[PDB]
Amino acid sequence: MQASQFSAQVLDWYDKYGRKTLPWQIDKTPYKVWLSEVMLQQTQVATVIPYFERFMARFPTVTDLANAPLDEVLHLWTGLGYYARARNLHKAAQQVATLHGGKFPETFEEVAALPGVGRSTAGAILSLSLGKHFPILDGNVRRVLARCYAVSGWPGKKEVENKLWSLSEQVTPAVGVERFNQAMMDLGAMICTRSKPKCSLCPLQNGCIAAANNSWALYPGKKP
Numbered sequence: 001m002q003a004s005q006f007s008a009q010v011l012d013w014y015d016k017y018g019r020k021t022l023p024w025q026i027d028k029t030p031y032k033v034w035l036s037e038v039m040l041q042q043t044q045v046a047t048v049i050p051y052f053e054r055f056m057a058r059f060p061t062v063t064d065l066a067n068a069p070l071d072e073v074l075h076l077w078t079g080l081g082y083y084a085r086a087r088n089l090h091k092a093a094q095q096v097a098t099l100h101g102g103k104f105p106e107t108f109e110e111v112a113a114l115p116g117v118g119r120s121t122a123g124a125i126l127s128l129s130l131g132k133h134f135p136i137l138d139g140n141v142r143r144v145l146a147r148c149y150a151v152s153g154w155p156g157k158k159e160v161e162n163k164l165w166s167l168s169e170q171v172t173p174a175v176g177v178e179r180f181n182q183a184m185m186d187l188g189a190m191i192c193t194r195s196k197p198k199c200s201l202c203p204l205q206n207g208c209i210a211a212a213n214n215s216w217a218l219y220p221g222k223k224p
């Protein structure tokens with residue numbers, strides 16, 4: 001599917017069927033998007049929403065989080081699992097207070113330098129909260145791209161990962177980047193699922209190679 005048709009059909013879908021009312025989409029800031037991205041890395045949206053609300057009520061700004069005791073942060077995280085995320089969350093808050101005056105940094109390199117934030121989470125923060133022109137590549141996005149363009153191979157191998165990032169870059173637009181990047185997460189979460197994807201509900205079904213061959217189970221590849 002040509003890249004301009006990909007982006008236009010995903011944006012047209014999002015306008016009518018996308019999720020726009022999550023709490024970290026209302027009156028968005030870099031801090032709210034970073035906190036939600038870290039909570040969502042390994043947890044389902046319905047479980048995260050009450051934790052996100054409790055964290056924003058107790059820590060309205062990144063400086064408030066930075067100045068709190070780590071034990072208090074770990075107490076409020078209880079139930080989300082994967083506590084290395086919480087330890088790195090507190091460290092990143094401290095890095096923003098210490099190096100950046102309490103204001104979230106707006107360049108790719110400074111965001112990626114934060115503990116617990118890698119290439120995709122950094123692109124997510126800057127595209128979704130400020131409209132900067134970066135693509136993402138979490139597991140939801142990787143599954144949609146690997147099926148639509150038939151990318152076999154384990155994404156654990158560097159050359160396959162590199163191919164998926166080039167494909168993401170190619171289809172991600174500048175105009176509407178915040179809508180597009182959220183829509184790709186929505187598609188992978190709710191429609192292009194690991195098992196038995198709902199292709200009839202997908203705006204890529206007219207150009208997707210996996211749908212044409214009923215071969216979604218091949219993409220992405222599994223570890224050998």
Ligand code: SF4
Nearest residue numbers: 192197199202205208
């Ligand atoms: S048409 Fe089906 S396999 Fe292809 S991207 Fe959409 S849900 Fe995934």
